[PDB]
Structures are given as C-alpha cells and as structure tokens.
Coordinates of C-alpha atoms in Angstrom, one line a residue:
Chain A
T1 CA 66.5 31.2 167.7
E2 CA 69.0 33.5 169.5
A3 CA 71.3 30.4 168.0
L4 CA 70.3 30.7 164.9
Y5 CA 70.4 33.3 164.5
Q6 CA 74.2 33.7 165.5
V7 CA 74.9 31.9 163.9
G8 CA 73.6 32.5 160.5
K9 CA 75.2 36.4 161.3
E10 CA 78.8 34.4 161.9
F11 CA 78.5 33.0 158.7
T12 CA 76.7 34.9 156.8
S13 CA 79.7 38.1 157.7
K14 CA 81.5 37.5 154.4
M15 CA 78.2 37.7 152.6
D16 CA 77.6 40.9 150.4
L17 CA 74.1 41.4 152.0
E18 CA 74.4 45.0 151.9
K19 CA 70.8 47.3 150.5
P20 CA 71.8 50.4 151.2
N21 CA 68.2 51.1 149.3
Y22 CA 67.2 48.8 151.9
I23 CA 62.8 49.5 153.1
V24 CA 61.9 48.7 157.0
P25 CA 58.1 47.0 156.0
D26 CA 55.7 48.2 158.6
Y27 CA 54.5 45.3 159.9
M28 CA 58.0 43.6 159.6
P29 CA 57.9 39.4 160.7
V30 CA 59.5 39.6 163.7
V31 CA 60.6 36.3 164.6
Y32 CA 64.5 37.2 166.7
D33 CA 63.3 38.6 169.7
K34 CA 66.3 40.8 170.5
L35 CA 66.4 41.7 167.0
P36 CA 67.3 45.7 166.8
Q37 CA 63.9 47.2 165.8
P38 CA 65.3 49.8 162.2
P39 CA 66.9 46.5 161.3
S40 CA 69.6 46.1 158.2
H41 CA 68.5 43.9 154.9
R42 CA 72.2 41.2 156.6
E43 CA 69.8 41.6 159.4
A44 CA 65.9 41.6 157.6
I45 CA 67.9 38.3 155.8
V46 CA 69.4 35.9 159.0
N47 CA 65.8 36.5 159.7
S48 CA 64.7 35.3 157.5
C49 CA 66.7 32.2 157.7
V50 CA 65.6 31.2 161.7
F51 CA 62.0 31.9 159.8
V52 CA 62.8 29.1 157.6
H53 CA 64.3 26.8 160.7
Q54 CA 61.2 27.5 162.1
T55 CA 58.9 26.9 159.2
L56 CA 60.2 23.2 159.5
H57 CA 59.8 22.4 162.5
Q58 CA 55.3 24.0 162.0
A59 CA 55.7 21.7 159.7
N60 CA 56.4 18.1 160.5
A61 CA 54.2 18.9 163.7
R62 CA 52.0 19.4 160.7
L63 CA 52.3 16.3 158.9
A64 CA 52.5 14.9 162.3
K65 CA 48.5 15.7 163.6
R66 CA 47.6 14.5 159.8
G67 CA 49.0 11.1 161.3
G68 CA 52.4 11.4 158.4
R69 CA 55.6 10.5 158.8
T70 CA 57.9 12.9 160.2
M71 CA 61.7 13.4 159.9
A72 CA 63.5 15.6 162.8
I73 CA 64.9 18.9 161.7
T74 CA 68.7 19.8 164.1
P75 CA 70.1 22.3 163.7
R76 CA 72.6 19.5 161.2
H77 CA 69.8 21.0 159.0
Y78 CA 70.2 24.9 159.6
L79 CA 74.0 24.7 159.0
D80 CA 73.1 23.2 155.4
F81 CA 71.0 25.0 154.8
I82 CA 73.5 28.8 154.9
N83 CA 76.4 26.6 153.9
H84 CA 73.6 26.2 150.5
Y85 CA 73.1 28.9 151.1
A86 CA 76.5 30.9 150.8
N87 CA 77.6 28.6 147.9
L88 CA 74.7 29.3 145.7
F89 CA 74.9 33.1 146.9
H90 CA 79.3 32.5 146.0
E91 CA 78.4 30.7 142.1
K92 CA 75.1 32.0 141.0
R93 CA 77.1 36.1 141.8
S94 CA 80.2 35.3 140.0
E95 CA 78.4 33.2 136.4
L96 CA 76.2 36.6 136.7
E97 CA 79.5 38.6 137.1
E98 CA 80.8 36.7 134.3
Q99 CA 78.3 37.3 131.7
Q100 CA 79.0 40.7 132.1
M101 CA 81.9 40.8 131.3
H102 CA 81.4 38.9 128.2
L103 CA 78.3 40.5 127.1
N104 CA 80.4 44.3 127.3
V105 CA 84.0 43.6 126.2
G106 CA 81.1 41.4 123.1
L107 CA 79.4 45.3 123.1
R108 CA 82.7 47.1 122.9
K109 CA 84.2 44.2 119.8
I110 CA 80.5 45.8 117.9
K111 CA 80.8 48.7 118.4
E112 CA 84.5 49.6 117.1
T113 CA 83.6 46.9 114.4
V114 CA 80.5 50.0 112.8
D115 CA 82.8 52.3 113.5
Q116 CA 86.0 50.9 111.2
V117 CA 83.1 51.0 108.6
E118 CA 82.0 54.4 108.8
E119 CA 86.7 54.8 107.7
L120 CA 86.0 52.2 105.3
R121 CA 83.3 53.3 103.8
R122 CA 85.4 57.0 103.3
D123 CA 88.2 55.1 102.0
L124 CA 85.7 54.2 99.0
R125 CA 84.9 57.7 98.7
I126 CA 88.2 58.2 98.5
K127 CA 90.2 55.9 96.4
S128 CA 86.9 56.7 93.8
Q129 CA 87.8 60.1 93.6
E130 CA 91.5 58.8 92.6
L131 CA 90.2 56.7 90.6
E132 CA 88.3 59.1 88.3
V133 CA 91.3 61.6 88.2
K134 CA 93.3 58.8 86.2
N135 CA 90.6 57.8 84.2
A136 CA 89.8 62.0 83.0
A137 CA 93.3 62.8 82.7
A138 CA 94.2 59.5 80.3
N139 CA 90.1 59.9 78.2
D140 CA 91.2 63.8 77.1
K141 CA 95.4 62.8 76.4
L142 CA 94.0 60.2 74.7
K143 CA 91.9 63.1 73.1
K144 CA 95.2 65.0 73.1
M145 CA 97.2 63.0 70.9
Chain B
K1 CA 117.9 55.0 151.3
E2 CA 120.1 55.7 148.3
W3 CA 117.7 52.6 146.2
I4 CA 118.5 53.3 143.1
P5 CA 116.7 51.8 140.0
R6 CA 118.9 49.2 137.5
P7 CA 119.3 48.3 134.1
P8 CA 119.0 44.9 135.2
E9 CA 115.6 44.0 135.6
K10 CA 114.1 40.6 138.1
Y11 CA 111.0 39.3 136.9
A12 CA 109.4 39.9 133.8
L13 CA 106.0 38.7 135.2
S14 CA 103.3 38.1 132.1
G15 CA 99.6 37.2 133.2
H16 CA 97.8 39.0 132.6
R17 CA 95.3 39.2 129.4
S18 CA 95.8 42.9 128.8
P19 CA 97.1 45.7 129.9
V20 CA 98.0 46.7 133.2
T21 CA 96.9 50.1 134.4
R22 CA 98.1 50.0 138.4
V23 CA 100.5 48.7 140.1
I24 CA 101.0 48.5 143.9
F25 CA 102.4 47.4 147.0
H26 CA 101.2 45.7 150.2
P27 CA 102.0 48.1 153.2
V28 CA 103.1 45.3 155.6
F29 CA 103.5 41.4 153.3
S30 CA 106.3 40.9 149.9
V31 CA 102.9 41.3 147.9
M32 CA 102.7 43.4 144.6
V33 CA 98.7 43.5 142.9
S34 CA 98.7 44.7 139.9
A35 CA 95.2 45.9 138.4
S36 CA 94.3 45.3 134.6
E37 CA 92.3 46.3 132.4
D38 CA 90.4 43.3 132.0
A39 CA 88.4 42.8 135.1
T40 CA 91.3 40.8 137.4
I41 CA 92.9 41.9 139.9
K42 CA 96.7 39.8 140.2
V43 CA 98.5 39.0 143.3
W44 CA 101.8 38.1 143.1
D45 CA 104.9 37.6 145.3
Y46 CA 107.5 40.5 144.0
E47 CA 110.6 38.3 145.6
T48 CA 110.0 35.4 144.1
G49 CA 108.2 36.5 140.5
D50 CA 105.8 33.7 141.8
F51 CA 101.7 34.4 140.1
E52 CA 99.9 34.2 144.0
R53 CA 96.4 34.6 143.1
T54 CA 93.6 36.6 141.2
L55 CA 90.5 38.2 142.4
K56 CA 87.9 38.8 139.1
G57 CA 85.1 40.1 140.3
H58 CA 85.2 43.2 138.7
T59 CA 82.1 43.5 135.8
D60 CA 84.9 46.2 133.2
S61 CA 88.5 47.2 133.4
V62 CA 89.6 47.4 137.1
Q63 CA 91.3 51.8 137.0
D64 CA 92.7 52.0 140.6
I65 CA 93.5 49.6 143.5
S66 CA 94.5 50.7 146.6
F67 CA 95.2 49.4 150.8
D68 CA 95.2 51.0 153.2
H69 CA 98.1 51.3 156.5
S70 CA 96.8 47.4 157.8
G71 CA 96.9 45.6 154.7
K72 CA 94.4 44.1 155.7
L73 CA 91.6 46.1 152.9
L74 CA 91.7 46.4 148.9
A75 CA 90.1 48.9 147.7
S76 CA 89.4 48.7 143.7
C77 CA 87.6 50.9 140.9
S78 CA 86.8 50.5 137.6
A79 CA 84.2 51.0 134.1
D80 CA 81.2 49.4 135.5
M81 CA 80.4 51.8 137.7
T82 CA 81.3 51.3 140.8
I83 CA 83.6 50.5 144.2
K84 CA 84.8 47.2 145.2
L85 CA 86.2 46.4 148.9
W86 CA 88.2 43.2 149.0
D87 CA 89.2 41.4 152.4
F88 CA 92.9 40.9 151.9
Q89 CA 92.5 37.7 154.7
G90 CA 90.2 35.2 152.3
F91 CA 90.3 37.3 149.5
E92 CA 86.8 38.2 148.9
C93 CA 85.2 40.9 147.6
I94 CA 82.6 42.0 150.7
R95 CA 80.8 45.4 150.1
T96 CA 79.9 46.4 146.2
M97 CA 79.1 50.0 146.6
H98 CA 77.8 51.3 143.9
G99 CA 76.1 55.5 142.5
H100 CA 79.0 57.7 141.4
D101 CA 77.8 57.6 137.3
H102 CA 79.9 56.5 135.2
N103 CA 83.3 55.4 134.7
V104 CA 85.8 54.9 137.5
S105 CA 89.1 56.1 137.6
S106 CA 91.2 55.8 141.6
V107 CA 90.1 55.6 144.8
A108 CA 91.7 55.7 147.6
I109 CA 91.4 55.1 151.3
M110 CA 93.1 57.8 153.7
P111 CA 94.8 56.6 156.3
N112 CA 92.7 57.0 159.4
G113 CA 91.7 53.4 157.8
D114 CA 87.5 53.9 157.7
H115 CA 86.6 56.2 154.6
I116 CA 87.2 56.5 151.1
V117 CA 87.5 58.4 148.2
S118 CA 86.3 58.3 144.6
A119 CA 87.4 59.8 141.5
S120 CA 84.5 59.4 138.5
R121 CA 83.9 60.9 134.2
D122 CA 81.2 62.4 135.8
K123 CA 84.0 65.0 136.7
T124 CA 83.0 64.9 141.1
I125 CA 84.4 63.5 143.8
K126 CA 82.7 60.3 146.3
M127 CA 83.3 59.8 149.4
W128 CA 82.2 56.0 151.5
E129 CA 82.4 54.6 155.1
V130 CA 84.3 51.1 154.7
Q131 CA 82.0 50.6 156.9
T132 CA 78.5 51.3 156.0
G133 CA 79.5 52.0 152.1
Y134 CA 76.9 54.8 152.1
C135 CA 77.5 58.1 150.4
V136 CA 77.6 60.9 152.9
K137 CA 79.5 63.7 150.4
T138 CA 79.5 64.1 147.6
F139 CA 82.3 67.2 146.2
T140 CA 81.7 69.0 142.6
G141 CA 83.9 71.8 141.3
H142 CA 85.6 69.8 139.0
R143 CA 84.4 71.2 135.5
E144 CA 85.8 67.6 133.3
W145 CA 86.6 64.2 134.1
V146 CA 89.3 63.5 136.8
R147 CA 91.7 61.1 136.8
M148 CA 93.9 60.5 139.8
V149 CA 92.9 61.4 143.5
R150 CA 95.5 61.3 146.6
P151 CA 94.8 62.4 150.2
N152 CA 97.3 63.4 152.8
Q153 CA 99.0 61.2 155.4
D154 CA 96.4 62.3 158.4
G155 CA 93.1 61.9 156.8
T156 CA 92.0 65.5 156.3
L157 CA 93.9 66.6 152.7
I158 CA 92.9 65.8 149.6
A159 CA 94.0 66.8 145.6
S160 CA 91.9 65.8 143.2
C161 CA 93.6 66.2 138.9
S162 CA 91.2 66.3 135.9
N163 CA 91.0 66.9 132.7
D164 CA 89.8 70.5 133.2
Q165 CA 93.6 71.8 133.7
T166 CA 92.9 72.1 137.3
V167 CA 93.9 70.9 139.9
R168 CA 92.0 71.1 143.6
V169 CA 92.7 70.4 147.2
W170 CA 89.8 70.4 149.2
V171 CA 89.6 69.8 153.2
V172 CA 87.3 66.8 154.8
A173 CA 85.4 69.0 157.5
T174 CA 84.9 72.2 155.4
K175 CA 84.4 70.3 152.1
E176 CA 85.7 73.2 150.5
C177 CA 88.3 74.3 147.2
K178 CA 90.9 75.4 149.8
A179 CA 93.3 76.0 147.2
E180 CA 92.4 75.6 142.9
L181 CA 95.5 75.4 140.2
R182 CA 94.8 76.3 137.2
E183 CA 98.8 76.6 135.4
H184 CA 99.0 73.7 133.3
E185 CA 100.0 73.1 129.2
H186 CA 97.9 70.4 129.2
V187 CA 95.5 68.0 130.5
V188 CA 97.4 66.3 134.1
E189 CA 96.8 63.0 134.9
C190 CA 99.1 61.8 138.0
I191 CA 99.6 63.4 141.3
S192 CA 101.3 62.4 144.9
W193 CA 102.4 63.9 147.4
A194 CA 104.9 64.4 150.2
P195 CA 106.1 62.2 152.5
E196 CA 107.4 63.9 156.1
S197 CA 111.8 63.3 155.5
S198 CA 111.1 65.8 151.9
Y199 CA 109.7 68.8 153.3
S200 CA 113.1 69.9 154.9
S201 CA 114.8 68.3 151.4
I202 CA 112.4 71.3 149.5
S203 CA 113.3 74.0 151.6
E204 CA 117.1 74.5 149.9
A205 CA 115.9 73.1 146.9
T206 CA 113.0 75.5 146.5
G207 CA 114.8 78.3 148.5
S208 CA 111.0 78.8 150.1
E209 CA 110.2 81.5 153.5
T210 CA 108.7 78.9 156.6
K211 CA 106.1 80.9 157.8
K212 CA 105.2 81.4 161.6
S213 CA 104.8 78.6 162.6
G214 CA 107.6 77.4 160.8
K215 CA 106.3 74.3 158.6
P216 CA 107.3 74.1 155.1
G217 CA 103.7 73.4 154.5
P218 CA 101.6 70.7 153.1
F219 CA 103.1 70.4 149.2
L220 CA 101.2 68.3 145.7
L221 CA 103.2 66.8 142.9
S222 CA 101.2 66.8 139.8
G223 CA 102.8 65.4 136.7
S224 CA 100.7 66.1 132.8
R225 CA 100.4 65.0 129.7
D226 CA 102.2 68.2 128.8
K227 CA 105.1 65.9 129.7
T228 CA 106.1 68.4 132.4
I229 CA 105.8 67.6 136.1
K230 CA 105.4 70.9 138.5
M231 CA 105.9 70.0 142.1
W232 CA 103.5 71.8 144.0
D233 CA 103.0 74.3 148.0
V234 CA 99.8 73.6 149.5
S235 CA 99.9 76.4 151.9
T236 CA 99.9 79.1 149.1
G237 CA 99.1 77.6 145.4
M238 CA 102.6 79.4 144.0
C239 CA 105.4 76.8 141.6
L240 CA 108.7 75.9 143.0
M241 CA 110.2 74.4 140.1
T242 CA 109.3 72.4 137.2
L243 CA 110.9 69.0 135.9
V244 CA 111.0 68.8 132.4
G245 CA 112.8 65.8 129.6
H246 CA 109.8 63.4 129.4
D247 CA 109.5 62.1 125.3
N248 CA 105.8 61.5 126.0
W249 CA 102.8 61.8 127.7
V250 CA 103.6 61.4 131.5
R251 CA 101.4 58.7 132.9
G252 CA 102.8 57.5 137.1
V253 CA 105.4 59.9 139.7
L254 CA 106.1 59.1 142.8
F255 CA 108.8 60.3 145.8
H256 CA 111.5 57.9 146.4
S257 CA 111.0 56.5 150.2
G258 CA 114.1 58.7 151.6
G259 CA 112.4 62.1 150.2
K260 CA 115.6 63.2 147.3
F261 CA 115.0 61.6 144.2
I262 CA 112.0 62.2 141.8
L263 CA 110.9 58.5 140.1
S264 CA 108.6 58.8 137.5
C265 CA 106.8 56.6 134.1
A266 CA 105.9 58.1 130.8
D267 CA 104.5 57.3 127.6
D268 CA 108.0 57.7 126.5
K269 CA 108.4 53.5 126.6
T270 CA 111.2 55.5 130.1
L271 CA 111.2 55.2 133.8
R272 CA 113.1 58.6 134.4
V273 CA 114.8 59.3 137.8
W274 CA 115.1 63.2 138.8
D275 CA 117.0 64.9 140.7
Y276 CA 115.5 68.0 141.8
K277 CA 116.8 69.7 145.1
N278 CA 120.7 70.2 142.7
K279 CA 119.6 68.5 139.0
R280 CA 122.3 65.9 139.5
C281 CA 121.1 63.1 138.6
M282 CA 119.2 62.6 134.8
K283 CA 118.6 58.8 134.7
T284 CA 116.7 57.2 132.2
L285 CA 115.7 53.5 132.2
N286 CA 113.8 51.8 128.9
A287 CA 111.7 49.2 131.0
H288 CA 109.4 48.2 128.4
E289 CA 108.7 48.0 124.3
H290 CA 105.5 49.6 124.9
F291 CA 102.9 52.3 126.7
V292 CA 104.6 52.5 130.4
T293 CA 101.6 52.7 132.7
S294 CA 101.9 52.6 136.3
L295 CA 105.1 52.3 138.8
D296 CA 105.6 51.6 142.5
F297 CA 108.7 52.1 145.3
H298 CA 108.5 50.1 147.6
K299 CA 109.0 51.8 151.6
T300 CA 112.0 49.6 152.8
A301 CA 112.5 47.1 150.3
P302 CA 114.9 48.0 147.6
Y303 CA 112.2 47.1 145.1
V304 CA 110.4 48.9 142.3
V305 CA 107.4 48.1 139.9
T306 CA 106.2 48.5 137.0
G307 CA 103.0 47.7 135.0
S308 CA 102.5 48.7 130.6
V309 CA 100.1 48.4 128.4
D310 CA 102.3 45.7 127.4
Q311 CA 100.5 42.8 130.0
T312 CA 104.4 42.8 131.2
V313 CA 104.6 43.7 134.7
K314 CA 108.5 44.2 136.1
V315 CA 110.8 44.3 138.7
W316 CA 114.1 46.1 138.9
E317 CA 116.1 46.1 142.0
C318 CA 117.6 49.5 143.7
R319 CA 120.5 50.4 144.8
Chain C
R1 CA 74.1 43.4 120.6
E2 CA 70.0 43.7 120.9
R3 CA 69.6 40.6 123.4
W4 CA 72.9 42.3 124.4
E5 CA 72.2 45.3 125.4
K6 CA 68.7 44.4 126.6
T7 CA 70.8 41.8 129.1
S8 CA 73.3 44.4 129.9
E9 CA 70.7 47.2 131.3
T10 CA 68.8 43.8 133.3
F11 CA 72.3 42.9 134.8
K12 CA 72.1 45.9 138.0
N13 CA 68.1 44.2 138.4
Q14 CA 69.7 40.6 138.6
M15 CA 72.2 41.4 141.1
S16 CA 70.0 42.8 143.0
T17 CA 68.2 40.1 143.1
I18 CA 70.5 36.6 144.4
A19 CA 70.0 37.6 147.4
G20 CA 66.6 35.6 148.2
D21 CA 66.3 33.5 144.9
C22 CA 69.8 32.2 146.6
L23 CA 67.7 31.9 149.6
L24 CA 64.7 30.1 148.4
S25 CA 66.9 27.9 146.8
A26 CA 69.5 26.6 149.2
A27 CA 66.3 26.6 151.7
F28 CA 65.1 24.4 148.9
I29 CA 68.1 22.1 148.7
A30 CA 68.4 21.7 152.2
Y31 CA 64.6 21.0 153.0
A32 CA 63.3 20.2 151.4
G33 CA 64.0 16.4 149.7
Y34 CA 61.6 14.7 152.4
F35 CA 59.2 16.1 151.3
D36 CA 55.9 15.7 148.9
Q37 CA 56.0 17.7 145.7
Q38 CA 52.2 19.3 147.6
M39 CA 54.2 19.8 151.5
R40 CA 56.9 20.8 149.1
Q41 CA 54.8 23.8 147.1
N42 CA 54.1 24.9 150.9
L43 CA 56.5 25.0 152.1
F44 CA 57.7 26.9 149.4
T45 CA 54.9 29.4 149.4
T46 CA 55.6 30.0 152.6
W47 CA 59.2 31.0 152.6
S48 CA 58.5 33.6 149.2
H49 CA 55.9 35.2 151.6
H50 CA 57.0 35.8 154.8
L51 CA 60.4 36.9 151.6
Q52 CA 57.9 39.1 150.8
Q53 CA 56.8 40.8 153.9
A54 CA 59.9 41.4 154.2
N55 CA 60.7 43.4 151.1
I56 CA 63.7 40.6 150.2
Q57 CA 63.7 40.7 145.9
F58 CA 63.3 37.4 144.9
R59 CA 62.5 36.0 140.8
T60 CA 59.2 34.7 141.1
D61 CA 59.1 33.8 137.6
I62 CA 61.6 31.5 137.2
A63 CA 61.6 28.2 138.5
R64 CA 63.5 26.5 140.5
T65 CA 64.7 23.3 138.3
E66 CA 65.7 25.9 135.5
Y67 CA 67.3 28.1 138.7
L68 CA 70.0 25.3 140.2
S69 CA 70.1 23.9 137.1
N70 CA 71.4 24.2 132.8
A71 CA 69.4 22.9 130.3
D72 CA 72.8 20.0 129.4
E73 CA 72.9 19.2 132.8
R74 CA 68.7 18.2 131.8
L75 CA 69.2 16.4 129.0
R76 CA 72.3 14.1 130.7
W77 CA 70.6 13.4 133.9
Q78 CA 67.2 12.3 130.7
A79 CA 70.3 10.4 129.1
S80 CA 71.1 8.8 131.7
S81 CA 67.2 7.4 132.3
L82 CA 65.8 10.2 134.6
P83 CA 62.3 10.5 135.3
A84 CA 60.6 13.7 132.8
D85 CA 59.4 15.1 135.9
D86 CA 59.3 18.5 138.3
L87 CA 59.9 16.5 141.4
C88 CA 62.2 14.6 139.4
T89 CA 64.5 17.1 138.2
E90 CA 64.4 18.4 142.0
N91 CA 65.3 15.0 143.6
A92 CA 69.1 15.1 141.0
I93 CA 69.5 18.8 141.5
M94 CA 69.7 17.8 145.6
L95 CA 71.5 14.8 144.6
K96 CA 74.6 17.1 143.1
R97 CA 74.2 20.1 145.2

C-alpha cells in the first residue's frame, strides 16, 4: 500500500489537485495506514487511487470464489490507471478552459453589439432631426416665393 | 552599463493574435516571456527572435506576469479572477489560486520566493503562499482599481498604485500603509523602485540630505496618465524631481541596470530615455505604429524589449 | 447569449469536479476492461461510494460513455458497424485511449 501511495504522489505531483476549501470527512476510509491524520485534497485523491487498486484485488477474489475466470492485477495496471488519470485531467481541463475562453469572447462581442445598437439609435435620431429642419426650411421658402 | 537602445530593431516578433500587455526577461536563461490579451503567454528566445512555446491555461486576457529570483516559477494574473503559477521546467500550470474578486491587474513575487502579491479591481491587494495557495493577508485602503504592484529587493515593502490618485507603501509585518502619496494630476499607472546601484546616483541628482543612519532610504517611482513621471522617497514621502515631456499616457517605467538613466514607454507611440542627474539625455525613439504597452530592460545583456497593442513584440539592442 | 451565460456561470463548478470525474473515468479505462457489465457497474459503484465518503466532488449525472467520447466519434464508430450498446461504446473508448 505504501508503494502505491508513493507512486501516486510522485506521479500526481505535477497535477493541480489542490482544493483549499476541502472538508475532511469525520470518518475517512483510511487505506494507506501512514496517511497524515488531517489529510489534504491531494492525499485524499492518492488514497482513493490506492483504494481502487485494492478494490480490483477484492473483485478478482469475489470472481474466483464464485468460480469465474480472473486475470491477474499487476502494478502495470496501477501505472496505466495513473497515466490515464493524468491524461484525462489535462485533456478535460484544457478543453474546459478553451470552451470558457471562446464563450467569454462571444459574450463580449454580443455586449459590444448591443452597445453599437444604442449608438445607431441616437445617430438615427440626429438624422431624423436634420431631415425635419431641411424639409421645413424648403417648404416655407417655397411659401415665400 | 551606458547601455542605450538604438533606432534600428533586431526582431519584431509577431505571434500574438491580440494586443500584448506585458513583457519580461528570464532571470538566467536567454528567454523572454510576453503576455497578451488573448489569454496566452508566449515564450521566445530574444537572442535569435525564435518562437519557443506558448502557455494557454488562462481563461480571459492575461494582464501581468512575473518570475522569481531563481526563474523556476512564473506567476501570472488575468481577467478571469485567478492567479496561476507555472512550473518553468516543464511549462505546465501547477497551482491556480482563486478568489480576489473581479479583474486582477498585477502580480509579483517578492525576492524571498515563497509568497506572491496580487492587485485587482476589488480595491485591495492579496498575499498568497506559493507552497500552499492560501490568501493569508489582505491589504485594504485603496478606494479604487489598483493597477500595478511591486515589492522591494528583500520582501518587506510593497507599493500599490491605483486609479484613486494615491500610491501606498505597505509593510509585510505590520500590514500598515507607512507612506501614502496623493499628489498626482491624473491616474497613476506604472511604478518601479530603485536598485542599490542607483541610490548613490540620486544623492547628487537631488541634493537630499542623509539621515543619522546615513542611508538615503528606499525609493519609488510612479508614472501617471497625466504624462508625468515622479520619483519619490520611501522614508519621507516628498517629491525630489519630476519628468515631463511624454506626449501621451505613460504605461511602463523602469531604471537602467546601471542606475544612471530612465527608460519609459508611453501611449505616445514612442520610447523615451531621459537623464535625471543632469537632464542631458532626452532621446525619443519611435517604437510601434500603435499604442506601446510595456517594456523591459535586461539585467546584464544589452537588450530591451517592448510589447505594444499592435500584437507585436520588438527587441532593441543597447549601445 | 443566455445559454453561454449559464455555461460560463457553471464553469467554476465544472472545474471543481474534474479531479473526481477523471479519476473515475481513468479507473474505468484501466481496470474495467475485462469484466462484464455487471462487475463493471459494481466496481464503478464502489469507487463512487468511496469518493463520496472522502468528500471528493464528482459529477453523478453524466454517463461515462458520454464523458469519454464525443458524438462525432460515436457516429463514426456506428458507421464502422460498432454495436449501439453501452458496453460496446466503453470497449471502443478503451480501444481508443
């Protein structure tokens, strides 16, 4: 269990995995015995990973007891698990960041659009006023003549 | 050294699709980093002007970026209300501290290399821990948008300029505004302090009298949108002399590494280097076809960089 | 505009659950390959309960097949005569990732 925990820590050190507002549960399902008593978010995540790896052993034992066919669970499975975790975290986070960026740009464009619509209205008002003055002048000059 | 930029450029780097907001130099490597308004922070090799990489973590437009003393971490702020910390060995974001409501404008790591300062529209300056990411203390007293923030040479004193016409110096331990300055004609935008090698050069430049300890005291400078660049005393809070002649709004100021000249950019499309001790050098050099946003001076190399609204970063030799 | 504003508002909450969602999806890709649907579901339920007990945020609404693959990829797989089944979709995802 210690080896799995250490591998998880070292592999996920690059990962963000930092929640400042993390709330420690009253009864945390402790898997790694040497886990710090007030664990952080990263330590909890690594504990969850180790728990998953041991859950696979329990599942294989359950299948063997019933008489089914089981495949050996190896540390290479753990390495694939953490590699997939890293890749999925990076991919999903980057995709979310891209989507939010583009949505923000679109919202800014729409706001600029409505602001320009308000400018267009007052431009139209000025145009109407000048048309009025011109037509009135011409009518009464014809009246003079 | 008597390093002076010259009208001919070396490279005009144009990779950003949006206006560039700030440019800095790597402390040790031959690397210059430019943040722009398209939420992307690009990394270039200024010696040969070669695009190296880009970091696209930020959501909204990146405002300010800053290295540490060792150059192993890169603090960045953006309009997405968050502060990102980048590991410069592999170039991936490692810690994204949140909070500090509304657009964050400036960010800086004081030389101790364990904490970060940040300033934003929410009229306050937050302190963060690099290792953990917890905002431990918040500085209040600015009544308006805080624009640019810089610490001292040993991580004890901080300067915050804002739209409120006041430049406030804050102390790490006591969290009190020891010096508050309200004297500028219009909004102060950019600040930068004096290195060691310049304090002596100020004494004959202004005629200031040494105190009982004999040290001239720490210094400030503040450029303000009123086209004025005013250099200030930390210990007293009184004006020594003022630089006037900038056509348009000033945006970036810093001291020459030798502590002898003044190099500043402004919205006047030009870069101005001015003498202060005897007011001899007044060289104005057109830099960009459009508004010029920020600049930086290399500590040892004879190079300076300027980032402008034209989505172009330019490199000037020093001679 | 309304939809984009809603999504931009929920951006922070989505970012909050990436760790849990990616943990579950990676565990499914790495481990649940050999098992039938019943045991895959049992393993997923056990992992979800453990994450709940550890106060680790994860989205319990989205399906794993939707989370790990986009609609275009699913349409292409169906064009490759892949059966329209959840387990077959999971198998294709594992054959991809």
